[PDB]
């Protein structure tokens, strides 16, 4: 079941890629993009109490507007992970559906201090397809939050070193 | 609180998601959209403790365990997010682990690619990918057998001071 | 965060990456007035329990000692044969050179059977951007039935200057 393979599949051409898109967490719609999975400490009217988990199938679009070209999906879960200032842990992938990156994914395991940090860095822990052996990071930042409902648009920039 | 020989291995084995009958290797952790047809509805979470055999038969040589959770992750179709380790119990890689964070997409891709996100023991500094095809699937009842191919880079050995510990005493390699 | 990030455009290898050893104590507080965790789902920690944690990291084994970070995330009971944990967590540091920075961990944690448990660093942030390495956790102080614990951590990461 183990089988040592030779390293000599070696020399590969390196690429750099910058992605820029908009992440849509649609809470209150008639077609919302997430669902609460668990809420110990109950339901707050605008915050997320420590311990609650949300599954998420959030669209990634070229611009702030929902009509703009779909370009990927952010799927996974986020969890309220601070008993002090509200913070989240993102455990998700970003799956690309467009052009040269269709089918490829990037993996994220990151803390997300949405209450206090204006530009938030997230670590790329892995990639697939075009992003095999991906090495990079992301910077996230609120484009808008609607605190009536709780919908949010997050602007992402991705910096990823990888191969062709 | 602060201070300041790479190998490459192919692995082949079989992943046993066992839902039906006695001996279920998993359990459902939450389902906010109840039960569904032949699907886990969006938001369902399932804890696994799945055997890893050298061949597709349950009776086959057990060689590791796939431990973690998966979540049904699409509203448009059935897809999974795997958050898991593969912990091996045999051979050179006994006691070693690989970690996976990956989208599955079990209804749309024959071969599903998954990034190796890190490793332990013999797999320290692991980087690589997995490919997963079904050997056998039953979206009616749920269980399935999944073939895996893993190609992983990694390094061997150890580093090179000890603090007293009332439990474990001294030493640490040191 | 910071207004610029520099790095080497390699994919693999260390190029301009350095090596750091961290040592601290992880506080799993289950009982008493103010616990550091919450049970999230429960389909002593039976298979499938999910716990969310917000655990203080201190430079010594005392709660008293200087706070240097938080370990935050979820753990899950992942084993049917004995109590075993999957950790999905970040370590966020708040002191000294690595104030602001984080490390990500995705790891099995065989708390009943392994006196030293190795956990993969799968990512970092800020001063730990592109982090690679491992943590070693061993108990300093454990009560298996109440659940409280102090875990000694040694962390070895390669990361850039």
Residue numbers in the entry:
A (entry chain C): 26 to 189
B (entry chain B): 26 to 29, 38 to 193, 199 to 212
C (entry chain A): 23 to 65, 72 to 189
What does the paper say about this structure?
GePTS1 and PsPTS1, in solution, exist mainly as trimers (∼68.0 kDa), with (because of association/aggregation) a small amount of higher-molecular weight entities also being evident (roughly corresponding to 410–500 kDa). The entrance to the putative active site of the GePTS1 and PsPTS1 monomers is located at the end of the barrel opposite the N and C termini.
The GePTS1 structure was solved by molecular replacement at 2.6 Å resolution. Six independent DP monomer molecules, labeled A–F, were located in the crystallographic asymmetric unit, arranged as a dimer of trimers. The buried surface area between the two trimers is small, and the biologically active form in solution is presumed to be a trimer, as confirmed by GPC analysis. The GePTS1 monomer is an eight-stranded antiparallel β-barrel comprised of two curved anti-parallel sheets formed by strands β1′, β2, β3, β4, β5, and β6′ (designated sheet I) and β6, β7, β8, and β1 (designated sheet II) that contact each other only slightly at the β1′-β8 and β5-β6′ interfaces. Currently, the GePTS1 structure is the only one that shows the trimer without requiring it to be generated by crystallographic symmetry, being found as a dimer of trimers in the asymmetric unit. The conserved polar residues in the active site of GePTS1—Asp50, Asp83, Tyr103, Asn137, Arg145, and Tyr181—are likely to facilitate this mechanism. All four GePTS1 mutants, when subjected to comprehensive kinetic analysis, displayed large reductions in catalytic turnover.
